[PDB]
Design an enzyme around this catalytic site. Sequence first.
Site, mmCIF file in Angstrom:
data_model
loop_
_atom_site.group_PDB
_atom_site.id
_atom_site.type_symbol
_atom_site.label_atom_id
_atom_site.label_comp_id
_atom_site.label_asym_id
_atom_site.label_seq_id
_atom_site.Cartn_x
_atom_site.Cartn_y
_atom_site.Cartn_z
ATOM 1 N N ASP A 33 8.518 -24.016 4.547
ATOM 2 C CA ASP A 33 8.307 -25.380 4.099
ATOM 3 C C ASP A 33 7.440 -25.231 2.849
ATOM 4 O OD1 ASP A 33 8.025 -28.030 3.517
ATOM 5 O OD2 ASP A 33 6.866 -28.533 5.228
ATOM 6 N N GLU A 41 19.182 -9.748 -8.499
ATOM 7 C CA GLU A 41 19.238 -11.267 -8.132
ATOM 8 C C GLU A 41 20.494 -11.745 -8.703
ATOM 9 O OE1 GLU A 41 16.441 -10.124 -9.628
ATOM 10 O OE2 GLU A 41 15.273 -9.639 -7.382
ATOM 11 N N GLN A 62 11.794 -16.753 -10.379
ATOM 12 C CA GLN A 62 13.095 -17.123 -10.325
ATOM 13 C C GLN A 62 13.380 -18.376 -11.316
ATOM 14 O OE1 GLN A 62 11.869 -19.190 -6.211
ATOM 15 N NE2 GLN A 62 13.723 -20.357 -6.840
ATOM 16 N N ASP A 87 12.577 -24.756 3.290
ATOM 17 C CA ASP A 87 13.291 -25.060 1.923
ATOM 18 C C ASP A 87 12.902 -23.745 0.918
ATOM 19 O OD1 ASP A 87 10.856 -25.459 1.061
ATOM 20 O OD2 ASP A 87 11.072 -27.556 0.566
ATOM 21 N N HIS A 88 12.343 -22.851 1.284
ATOM 22 C CA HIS A 88 11.820 -21.878 0.298
ATOM 23 C C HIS A 88 11.937 -20.312 0.867
ATOM 24 C CE1 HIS A 88 10.198 -20.589 -3.462
ATOM 25 N NE2 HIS A 88 8.927 -20.150 -3.188
ATOM 26 N N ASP A 114 18.537 -10.680 12.673
ATOM 27 C CA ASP A 114 17.698 -12.011 12.863
ATOM 28 C C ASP A 114 16.692 -11.827 13.862
ATOM 29 O OD1 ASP A 114 19.180 -14.055 10.779
ATOM 30 O OD2 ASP A 114 20.946 -13.633 12.060
ATOM 31 N N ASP A 133 20.353 -14.043 4.486
ATOM 32 C CA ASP A 133 21.410 -13.710 5.358
ATOM 33 C C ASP A 133 22.914 -13.348 4.469
ATOM 34 O OD1 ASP A 133 19.852 -13.025 7.487
ATOM 35 O OD2 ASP A 133 20.468 -14.433 8.662
ATOM 36 N N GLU A 185 0.791 -1.277 0.013
ATOM 37 C CA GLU A 185 0.160 0.097 0.099
ATOM 38 C C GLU A 185 0.761 1.095 0.081
ATOM 39 O OE1 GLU A 185 -2.892 -0.072 3.309
ATOM 40 O OE2 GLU A 185 -3.474 -2.031 2.738
ATOM 41 N N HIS A 237 5.358 -29.158 -0.426
ATOM 42 C CA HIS A 237 4.394 -29.998 -0.789
ATOM 43 C C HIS A 237 3.647 -29.689 -2.011
ATOM 44 C CE1 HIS A 237 5.455 -30.096 3.747
ATOM 45 N NE2 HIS A 237 4.733 -31.193 3.577
ATOM 46 N N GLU A 295 19.274 -14.191 -15.193
ATOM 47 C CA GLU A 295 19.359 -15.482 -16.238
ATOM 48 C C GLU A 295 18.989 -16.749 -15.881
ATOM 49 O OE1 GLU A 295 23.204 -12.881 -18.161
ATOM 50 O OE2 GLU A 295 23.433 -14.838 -17.423
#
Length: 215
Positions: A137, A50, A19, A162-163, A114, A71, A9, A140, A92
């Site tokens: 996670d 990136e 990605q 993992d993401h 952190d 980090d 906003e 799934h 790329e």
Amino acid sequence: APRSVDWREKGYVTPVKNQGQCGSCWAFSATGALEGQMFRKTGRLISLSEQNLVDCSGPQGNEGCNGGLMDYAFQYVQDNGGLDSEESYPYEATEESCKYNPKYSVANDTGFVDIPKQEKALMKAVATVGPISVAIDAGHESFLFYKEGIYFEPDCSSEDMDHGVLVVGYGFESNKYWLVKNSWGEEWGMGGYVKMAKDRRNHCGIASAASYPTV
Ligand SMILES: NC(N)NCCC[C@@H](NC(=O)[C@H](CSCc1ccccc1)NC(=O)Cc1ccc(-c2ccccc2)cc1)C(=O)N[C@@H](Cc1ccc(O)cc1)C(=O)NCCc1ccccc1
């Protein structure tokens, strides 16, 4: 803290990116967080590179398309003294040689913080800092097929995430959720976003690895 927060906003978030078939989510999560912090500091929103992170942050511990941490990305920018813009250093979706050019640097940070591994703490950070980098996670098929609504996966882990994604806010429906920006394109989920269960015992471990760069 407010009942709801949506940094989109106030112009802190760039459009959703993709990605592709590359384990560079940590890089997109990192640029998303920096893009927000650089915006609060300069009032200017500039999409970051990136690719710059993927090709050069190896010394910090990142592994290009094979994974990494937000980090480490933040640490790289601090060590590097800058980070190129998305425009000057195009994505790329594959690891290349470092082509960092200080002349095109449009961002920088002096380290990172952190956040305590608590949803309560993540809420305060989001409400007082801006978009926050987090890990969940997402392994799934329920996540792969996500289209709309509050995402709740019974088999989700709060231990192994993992993401790397980006929390741009939080709210509730008329039931609480975190507004999360993914990096799988704008056709996935809600325009590239996903509303994930908030205050459901750190669902999918969203508050286990939260952080942001200090500018
Ligand atoms: N178990 C742990 N930890 N393994 C490491 C994982 C490595 C890396 N992350 C990925 O490779 C992600 C995993 S997404 C979930 C999934 C799991 C199974 C099958 C399939 C999909 N891949 C992607 O997003 C790729 C992608 C997948 C699918 C579509 C897509 C979209 C629409 C329609 C069709 C397809 C488009 C794109 C990664 O580095 N993730 C980071 C996330 C993170 C975690 C904690 C944190 O603090 C910060 C970031 C990580 O786990 N980092 C810890 C590991 C590490 C450390 C240093 C160097 C290398 C690796």
